Amino acid sequence: SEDRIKDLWRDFFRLYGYSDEINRIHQEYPEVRTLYVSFRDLEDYNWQFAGSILVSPEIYIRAGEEVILQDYLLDRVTQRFNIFNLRIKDLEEKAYRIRDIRSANIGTLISVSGIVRKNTEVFPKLKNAAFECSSCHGLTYVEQTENRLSEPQVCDHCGLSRGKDKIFFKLRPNLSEFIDVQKVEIQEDPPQRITIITEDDLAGLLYPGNRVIVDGILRTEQRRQGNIPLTEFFTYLYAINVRKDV
Ligand SMILES: [Zn+2]
Numbered sequence: 001s002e003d004r005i006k007d008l009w010r011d012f013f014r015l016y017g018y019s020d021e022i023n024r025i026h027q028e029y030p031e032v033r034t035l036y037v038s039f040r041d042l043e044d045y046n047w048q049f050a051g052s053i054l055v056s057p058e059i060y061i062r063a064g065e066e067v068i069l070q071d072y073l074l075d076r077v078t079q080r081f082n083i084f085n086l087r088i089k090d091l092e093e094k095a096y097r098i099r100d101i102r103s104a105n106i107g108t109l110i111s112v113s114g115i116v117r118k119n120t121e122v123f124p125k126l127k128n129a130a131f132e133c134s135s136c137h138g139l140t141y142v143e144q145t146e147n148r149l150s151e152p153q154v155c156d157h158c159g160l161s162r163g164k165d166k167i168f169f170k171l172r173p174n175l176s177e178f179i180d181v182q183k184v185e186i187q188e189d190p191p192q193r194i195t196i197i198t199e200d201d202l203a204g205l206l207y208p209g210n211r212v213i214v215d216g217i218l219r220t221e222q223r224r225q226g227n228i229p230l231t232e233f234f235t236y237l238y239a240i241n242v243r244k245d246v
Helices: 002-015 021-027 040-047 047-055 058-070
Strands: 034-038 086-091 109-119 123-132 139-143 170-171 177-187 195-197 211-225 228-246
Touching: 002 058, 002 139, 021 034, 034 040, 034 123, 040 047, 040 086, 047 058, 047 109, 058 086, 086 139, 086 228, 109 195, 109 228, 170 195
Parallel strands: 034 086, 195 228
Antiparallel strands: 109 177, 109 211, 123 139, 123 170, 123 177, 177 195, 211 228
């Protein structure tokens, strides 16, 4: 249950003394909107809960973020400004060579190490999209999670929908929230390669030659032979935490 997961986060933040840090972030939100939580603390709290985070990080991390937004930051949160990053650190004691990654790892939180070989420019990605209702001209915000734009079906202000009422929504970029994104390709230390997606506070940190360890969610991306959809995919890592060394 989502409610049960949120309840577990609520007790955790309090028990392990994160409330003070969160309240400090509160003073600087939304300019500051990231909290790092120690996996060592999570394990000490409830090792089943800790293990579940490794298996279903998107669901568990999102739940934690909701608790922070609803219970701690609410008076600084709006329909537009509702972004928060809950990140996990201190996973080093709890790792895969790039060549050892398999399909069984997809959707889970793993750690990968390598040398940075390439990076893209830092570019903006739509994160919280403002949509204007053709009827009442009110704004419905929709969080974006995919490469393709997710549009609303029903208006949050007047309750009409595209299907039954034939209304349409107009994207309003200037009223939307964007985040920085950067893709970084790493290679095994002599070798296979994998791409890491770094977003928001993690974008713009990695450069060619850097030795990195990245904790992230293993994702899949579809191969395309120009237009045509293939069943062949490749894996990439969505970064949750990044560490460098020389
Ligand atoms: Zn409307």
